[PDB]
Design a protein around this motif. Structure first.
Motif, PDB file in Angstrom:
ATOM      1  N   UNK D  10       0.928  -1.253   0.083  1.00 51.91           N
ATOM      2  CA  UNK D  10      -0.058   0.041  -0.186  1.00 51.91           C
ATOM      3  C   UNK D  10       0.993   1.206  -0.070  1.00 51.91           C
ATOM      4  N   UNK D  11       0.485   2.414  -0.537  1.00 52.72           N
ATOM      5  CA  UNK D  11       1.103   3.634  -0.529  1.00 52.72           C
ATOM      6  C   UNK D  11       1.126   4.366   0.838  1.00 52.72           C
ATOM      7  N   UNK D  12       1.608   5.317   1.302  1.00 53.46           N
ATOM      8  CA  UNK D  12       1.535   6.033   2.572  1.00 53.46           C
ATOM      9  C   UNK D  12       0.773   7.200   2.097  1.00 53.46           C
ATOM     10  N   UNK D  13      -0.091   7.497   3.132  1.00 51.16           N
ATOM     11  CA  UNK D  13      -1.387   8.464   2.967  1.00 51.16           C
ATOM     12  C   UNK D  13      -1.088   9.484   3.856  1.00 51.16           C
ATOM     13  N   UNK D  14      -0.622  10.751   3.437  1.00 49.79           N
ATOM     14  CA  UNK D  14      -0.305  12.013   4.381  1.00 49.79           C
ATOM     15  C   UNK D  14      -1.633  12.528   3.969  1.00 49.79           C
ATOM     16  N   UNK D  15      -2.584  12.818   5.255  1.00 48.72           N
ATOM     17  CA  UNK D  15      -3.933  13.760   5.378  1.00 48.72           C
ATOM     18  C   UNK D  15      -3.342  14.981   5.562  1.00 48.72           C
ATOM     19  N   UNK D  16      -3.816  15.825   4.843  1.00 50.86           N
ATOM     20  CA  UNK D  16      -3.344  17.283   4.840  1.00 50.86           C
ATOM     21  C   UNK D  16      -4.687  18.220   5.406  1.00 50.86           C
ATOM     22  N   UNK D  17      -4.710  19.436   5.495  1.00 56.29           N
ATOM     23  CA  UNK D  17      -5.404  20.334   5.716  1.00 56.29           C
ATOM     24  C   UNK D  17      -4.864  21.870   6.125  1.00 56.29           C
ATOM     25  N   UNK D  18      -5.449  22.699   5.460  1.00 52.65           N
ATOM     26  CA  UNK D  18      -5.143  24.197   5.486  1.00 52.65           C
ATOM     27  C   UNK D  18      -6.309  24.845   5.966  1.00 52.65           C
ATOM     28  N   UNK D  19      -5.732  25.905   7.077  1.00 53.69           N
ATOM     29  CA  UNK D  19      -6.695  26.622   7.635  1.00 53.69           C
ATOM     30  C   UNK D  19      -6.335  28.174   7.614  1.00 53.69           C
ATOM     31  N   UNK D  20      -6.974  29.044   7.075  1.00 57.36           N
ATOM     32  CA  UNK D  20      -6.380  30.208   6.439  1.00 57.36           C
ATOM     33  C   UNK D  20      -6.672  31.137   7.400  1.00 57.36           C
ATOM     34  N   UNK D  21      -5.612  31.995   8.290  1.00 55.27           N
ATOM     35  CA  UNK D  21      -5.575  32.794   9.375  1.00 55.27           C
ATOM     36  C   UNK D  21      -5.681  34.179   8.683  1.00 55.27           C
ATOM     37  N   UNK D  22      -4.669  34.496   7.836  1.00 55.83           N
ATOM     38  CA  UNK D  22      -4.945  35.895   7.131  1.00 55.83           C
ATOM     39  C   UNK D  22      -4.650  35.671   5.655  1.00 55.83           C
ATOM     40  N   UNK D  23      -5.339  36.409   4.718  1.00 54.81           N
ATOM     41  CA  UNK D  23      -5.568  36.125   3.327  1.00 54.81           C
ATOM     42  C   UNK D  23      -5.540  37.577   3.099  1.00 54.81           C
ATOM     43  N   UNK D  24      -4.410  38.162   2.163  1.00 56.19           N
ATOM     44  CA  UNK D  24      -4.191  39.505   1.621  1.00 56.19           C
ATOM     45  C   UNK D  24      -3.280  39.854   0.437  1.00 56.19           C
ATOM     46  N   UNK D 149     -13.101  33.627  10.802  1.00 55.12           N
ATOM     47  CA  UNK D 149     -14.068  34.535  10.575  1.00 55.12           C
ATOM     48  C   UNK D 149     -13.691  35.941  10.058  1.00 55.12           C
ATOM     49  N   UNK D 150     -12.592  36.568  10.744  1.00 54.12           N
ATOM     50  CA  UNK D 150     -12.015  37.708  10.413  1.00 54.12           C
ATOM     51  C   UNK D 150     -11.420  37.843   9.080  1.00 54.12           C
ATOM     52  N   UNK D 151     -11.099  36.731   8.400  1.00 53.72           N
ATOM     53  CA  UNK D 151     -10.309  36.603   7.118  1.00 53.72           C
ATOM     54  C   UNK D 151     -10.951  37.625   5.999  1.00 53.72           C
ATOM     55  N   UNK D 152     -10.172  38.687   5.716  1.00 55.57           N
ATOM     56  CA  UNK D 152     -10.602  39.886   4.971  1.00 55.57           C
ATOM     57  C   UNK D 152      -9.717  39.869   3.665  1.00 55.57           C
ATOM     58  N   UNK D 153     -10.206  39.968   2.619  1.00 54.79           N
ATOM     59  CA  UNK D 153      -9.339  40.595   1.342  1.00 54.79           C
ATOM     60  C   UNK D 153      -9.862  41.465   0.824  1.00 54.79           C
ATOM     61  N   UNK D 154      -9.108  42.488   1.016  1.00 50.47           N
ATOM     62  CA  UNK D 154      -9.358  44.006   0.607  1.00 50.47           C
ATOM     63  C   UNK D 154      -9.705  44.083  -0.754  1.00 50.47           C
ATOM     64  N   UNK D 155     -10.890  44.816  -0.974  1.00 46.44           N
ATOM     65  CA  UNK D 155     -11.591  45.063  -2.185  1.00 46.44           C
ATOM     66  C   UNK D 155     -12.306  43.664  -2.918  1.00 46.44           C
ATOM     67  N   UNK D 156     -12.373  42.666  -1.998  1.00 40.46           N
ATOM     68  CA  UNK D 156     -12.800  41.237  -2.364  1.00 40.46           C
ATOM     69  C   UNK D 156     -13.827  40.721  -1.283  1.00 40.46           C
ATOM     70  N   UNK D 157     -14.945  39.899  -1.860  1.00 39.15           N
ATOM     71  CA  UNK D 157     -15.661  39.097  -0.956  1.00 39.15           C
ATOM     72  C   UNK D 157     -15.309  37.641  -0.804  1.00 39.15           C
ATOM     73  N   UNK D 158     -14.919  37.156   0.133  1.00 47.45           N
ATOM     74  CA  UNK D 158     -14.322  35.490   0.212  1.00 47.45           C
ATOM     75  C   UNK D 158     -15.831  34.811   0.215  1.00 47.45           C
ATOM     76  N   UNK D 159     -16.088  34.022  -0.770  1.00 45.24           N
ATOM     77  CA  UNK D 159     -17.243  33.054  -0.861  1.00 45.24           C
ATOM     78  C   UNK D 159     -17.060  31.817  -0.091  1.00 45.24           C
ATOM     79  N   UNK D 160     -16.099  30.898  -0.438  1.00 47.27           N
ATOM     80  CA  UNK D 160     -15.729  29.630   0.213  1.00 47.27           C
ATOM     81  C   UNK D 160     -14.189  29.240   0.094  1.00 47.27           C
ATOM     82  N   UNK D 161     -13.865  28.335   1.078  1.00 46.83           N
ATOM     83  CA  UNK D 161     -12.438  27.845   0.997  1.00 46.83           C
ATOM     84  C   UNK D 161     -12.633  26.084   1.120  1.00 46.83           C
ATOM     85  N   UNK D 162     -12.353  25.608   0.062  1.00 42.71           N
ATOM     86  CA  UNK D 162     -12.672  24.089   0.054  1.00 42.71           C
ATOM     87  C   UNK D 162     -11.396  23.206  -0.681  1.00 42.71           C
ATOM     88  N   UNK D 163     -11.452  22.230  -0.585  1.00 43.12           N
ATOM     89  CA  UNK D 163     -10.435  21.355  -1.157  1.00 43.12           C
ATOM     90  C   UNK D 163     -10.966  20.236  -2.047  1.00 43.12           C
TER      91      UNK D 163
END
Ligand SMILES: CCCCCCCCCCCC(=O)OC[C@H](COP(=O)(O)OCC[N+](C)(C)C)OC(=O)CCCCCCCCCCC
Ligand SMILES: CCCCCCCCCCCC(=O)OC[C@H](COP(=O)(O)OCC[N+](C)(C)C)OC(=O)CCCCCCCCCCC
Ligand SMILES: [Cl-]
Ligand SMILES: [Cl-]
Ligand SMILES: [Cl-]
Ligand SMILES: [Cl-]
Ligand SMILES: [Cl-]
Ligand SMILES: [Cl-]
Ligand SMILES: [Cl-]
Ligand code: NA
Ligand code: NA
Ligand code: NA
Ligand code: NA
Ligand code: NA
Ligand code: NA
Lengths: 311, 311, 311, 311, 311
Positions: D10-24, D149-163
């Motif tokens: 079997x191959x080795x499975x590395x489970x991942x996850x990204x949690x955005x703190x600041x987006x700019x 929840x505070x994640x704000x991208x100046x001049x833009x509206x953040x709709x979703x963050x999915x994988x």
């Protein structure tokens, strides 16, 4: 490692000296300048003392890791200085002579009130935090404070580089701090401002006044409005090379005042035309003839008043 | 590690050489240029000597950590050079041959007096601080000084890369310093300035002079004022590509002088109109006819005088 | 560590390959581009050979520290590349397979002669310095040279990424250097230049020619001078997106030539008025009628001549 | 260290996850955005298994150096991410839970076709290169994928963050690569464009149409030419906030089309004058009267057609 | 090293305090500010406790490496803070007193609604992630929270620097997080905006209204159109110093509304001329006379309404 032990209850004196190698990038908008200098430190550590007869050597060299070195920081720097140790030399009595070459972006505020005929005092603040074992006090070794002859700050004249010998000793976060003030006195090279901003700005103003020797409203409107737009361009160009001050700058005052002259010229031009149309060219002639003397005289006096208030 | 021991009281000679690989980013406003070169160092360390018969090898390679390497720094760099060692090779007599590839932002001043028809001498200053054991002196190994054929500095012509072979030996903070001067002679590629600034600026000036073949004040006012504004835009555009100098540049002088021509054109245009209105078109005709010859002649002579003073 | 020993007097062949992951930031003014790629290296080191039967494993992995790795550098990079080793794999015969991921700001010059209808060949030069033990020569493993499909260079079309398989072997500071040429062929996306610069610039020129269907000097002066100023703005806007070249660019030539058309339009407008005033409107009519055909015809032919010389 | 050994093939499975703190810093010209997030990794290494009774501790903490950690890289980053390890926690079965906080400048392309009424999908690509011992495959642990929840991208509206949970497994340089797609869906805040560019641009166009209610050629020429220059300034201002696209943007199309309206207005103004002079003011009146309806109607319909094609 | 052990099931309280040394570079467009401060941390570690009688010393100093230090991070920073430890001091009971000097680019959003008469609350968020051994909670030591008197933020007035004493304790990726809010209250120095943007903008508007005292269409068209272009330049200049907001700013509203005044002035100027031509100068006189009062009155009332809605 621990700090040197006291003979009695005296504080430890760290003698300092800054020797400027390269001085550059004075940003008026940011109120910062970049420096590249030597930092020399000297203190006595009796633990490092040695007999020159027994040891053979007259001075001993050490690596920073080997001995205790005071944690000296700059107050008004942007980020922590980039430093590289040149030399550490111990004499038989235990007198350590530290030398490092550093570079830092120093944040010292500027007084634009007399701009571009201003002089500044740039500051470099050295500080040291006292440890619990003993209090550390800074000093100025005047023989190790100087600057290179080649040191050139573009668009500025370097007058002096001196240090206020008595440190500012004060409490901070329940520990004694010894601050030192290194002052770099500079004065702006105003020469370029004259053929690039001042004289062009006066020429466009005088061109607007040729409307006092013209009865053509269409031509006057063009003369006063077109030259007003060139004055707007000079106002924008000037305010880009400068930060937003809570006070009036010398050039700012002249630039502002010149708007009033354009506004009154538009009024005169309008009055002259209204009168000509109303079949009163005699009265319009009196106003136009008066304006020819009034405008230069009021401009010259207002400028004497401003130069007086500012200098 | 300690420096090599002297046979007698002679100083240690570190032979140097810089070979430019990439030369780029000459910022006129900042008076800086970026360099990417080879720095070669060579000195004799008798402690490293070996018999080629007994050791088998003709040369021995060492890692920087293994042996003593002189602390060589650049004087006029902005921050410390980024360097990476290519090779360290020791010959049987103990002659070390060090090679590193470095990059640095060098701060060498520029003379804009003849801009954009100027030539510069960029400097790279190598320096070395003498240690307490023995004094260190720099030298130039001319076979290891050069530049790549591909070396191109955008908007500039690279004339020569040479070194002033005799170092400047002087005292600094009570220790001998040996400074070396590497000179990169370059000359500006003025070609682009001609179709982009010079000829457009002359065309707008000549357009202003078509007012000497027009009796229409409204049209003349538009011609001379509109073209004066385009000249302001060229003055602004030029002074953005340059730093604020305490002297007059060649382009600066021409640009300034052209303002006077616009100012006198406004006076002539105003005089012509005043006279026409005053019912003296014959006198206005004489002035306008004279201006047609006066303006080009005075412009041409004033330019001969300027070119003479500047070149 | 020392380099692999030769079986005979042959040089050591380091097989190379670059695989572009991200290609970005092509600065026309700076003549630089940023690259993010894989660099793969392969050479035989007999000292690393092993029996797969005795050792159990088919390949052995090593850390850079453990074995000898050739010092490969980029010639035309700005600063030394940022690299991170992905993998080092040794096969039983001693064939090492090195892989690293790097990023660098590459300095490759551009030919703006046909701008914005130009095509460029960006270069990435790999180099290697021979050691005293043995000479090192570079090679191209074509199976390990490529680019990702997603690779996009904003405002450019990526045509090909290939390597000149035979290296440029030459002497430098009395040691053999083996240089390799990786060529990235790109062509500019000229589309945006058409509705943003070319067509707006032609529209303002054609508007200036409506003066040939007008007898109003005041209106003509406004038409030709106002549109000339908009042409100055387009000249300034264009020369900001480009560096100062010692040759004429295609857009540069058209922009320059268009100034002459504005200058001749001012002359015609002036001649027409002088003649009308001189009570010769019949002659002024002939000149104006001729200009209506002359100006478009000469503009169209001059453009055919330019497109011919440039393409 | 070597990778964990397989129980079977079997191959080795590395489970991942990204949690955005600041987006700019979303740069439209550069097609880059800066991100500051948590990167969480999880894989089983049976070699790290322990008895909690014997070891005293439910979980063991390790420094990155102590154990094997998969070499996870980002595909579309500019330079290597700046990362700092927050925690590494091993459970008794050997399950490693890695956490790091990173910052990177991500290079994800943008579709300006509907600008400034556009929506984008920014991408963050995680990748892993398989080693010779065993193949490594990425996975998405959805409980460890999110944004603050505070994640704000100046001049833009953040709709979703999915994988995109299924990785793209492919061959690259004869080794398996497991790529993961993290998608940040955003939509532009077009509001500021309306009072700053769109409405000012329409006002200047409507001002040009007041020439259809004027018989004064001199005034019309001024009205249409002056407003055309303001439109040039808006075209320049807009194309500065955007990169050079090989396609037409929505604002680009409107801006371009408006030039044609200015060009036809100049033609009408010229025709009206020619006719008035030719003593045909009746015919000129018909054309002027028609233009009053034609211009707004054609402008309104052309805009309906454009909005239709683009949306 | 492991975290301190609990006496009972209580969490570990890390007392914090930030003391601002230098505060600078508030970028309105980027919504960032740079900070240079002291970060003080204090917690009890019973493992470090000692008898002052037996040990002789009253406090023990340790290097960060020697003891356990909580991993404190900033939430809204751009990249990880640059920090350097000033001191670590342990009291006999085991109370650790950590001090570090740091610099960071903080990303705190701004409310431009009342620009340039706005006040902001800049935030610095301190956070801590709980370990598996025990939960970590933040606290505010108010005696160790402050700012230097010299602290100057160019173009801003620093009102207060306080901390919200109760932390925000929440779950994140199945572990407790303790967030603290440090608030820097500042208010803009609006003074420079008055002579540089507001008064110049009002002067050009009032100049446009001199068209209500002129019957010359050609002159009025020039007056209203030329001043409209200067207003466009001020709109562009203002929107460059600010980011694209999804709401209307105070200056934005005034700037926008002034366009309507220019548009209505063009209509009045057009109506006056149409009527004069139509041989109805009496009716045109009534409209012009009314506009002289209407325009200033409507401008003054509209401004009262705006100031009311915004303040
Ligand atoms: C009585 C004249 C009123 C004019 C009102 C015009 C309002 C236009 C509103 C646009 C809204 C977006 C479209 C531009 C039209 C220009 C108006 C010219 C008016 C000429 C009047 C002639 C005198 C009888
Ligand atoms: C066109 C002309 C526009 C002039 C705008 C006037 C300024 C204004 O009305 O600004 C309003 C600010 C308010 O300051 P505040 O402390 O935030 O009041 C907050 C009040 N609440 C909390 C009750 C809502 O007053 C000033 O700064 C006054 C001095 C500036 C005068 C500039 C005149 C030119
Ligand atoms: Cl410091
Ligand atoms: Cl250096
Ligand atoms: Cl490299
Ligand atoms: Cl050769
Ligand atoms: Cl060789
Ligand atoms: Cl990465
Ligand atoms: Cl941080
Ligand atoms: Na030390
Ligand atoms: Na060494
Ligand atoms: Na190696
Ligand atoms: Na590891
Ligand atoms: Na620790
Ligand atoms: Na005009």
């Amino acid at each position: 490692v621990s700090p040197p032990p006291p003979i009695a209850d005296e504080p430890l004196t760290v003698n300092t000296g800054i020797y400027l190698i390269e001085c550059y990038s004075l940003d008026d908008k940011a109120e910062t300048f970049k420096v590249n200098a030597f930092l020399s430190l000297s203190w006595k550590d009796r633990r490092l003392a040695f007999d020159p007869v027994r040891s053979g050597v007259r001075v001993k060299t050490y690596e920073p890791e080997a001995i205790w070195i005071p944690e000296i920081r700059f107050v008004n720097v942007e980020n922590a200085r980039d430093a590289a140790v040149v030399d550490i030399s111990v004499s038989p009595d235990g007198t350590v002579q530290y030398l490092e070459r550093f570079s830092a972006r120093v944040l010292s505020p500027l007084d634009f009130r007399r701009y571009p005929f201003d002089s500044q005092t740039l500051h470099i603040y050295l500080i040291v935090r006292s440890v619990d074992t003993r209090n550390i006090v800074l000093a100025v070794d005047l023989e190790k404070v100087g600057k290179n002859d080649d040191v050139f700050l573009t668009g500025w004249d370097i007058e002096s580089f001196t240090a206020v010998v008595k440190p500012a000793n004060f409490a901070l976060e329940d520990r004694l701090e010894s601050k030192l003030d290194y002052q770099l006195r500079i004065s702006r090279q105003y020469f370029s401002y004259i053929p690039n901003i001042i004289l062009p700005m006066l020429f466009i103003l005088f061109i607007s006044w040729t409307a006092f020797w013209s009865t053509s409203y269409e031509a006057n409107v063009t003369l006063v409005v077109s030259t007003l737009i060139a004055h707007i361009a000079f106002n924008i160009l000037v305010e880009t090379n400068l930060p937003k001050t809570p006070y009036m700058t010398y050039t700012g005052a002249i630039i502002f005042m010149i708007y009033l002259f354009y506004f009154v010229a538009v009024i005169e031009v309008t009055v002259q035309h209204y009168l000509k149309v109303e079949s009163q060219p005699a009265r319009a002639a009196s106003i136009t003839r008066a304006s020819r003397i009034a405008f230069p005289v009021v401009f010259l006096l207002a400028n004497i008043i401003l130069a007086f208030l500012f200098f």
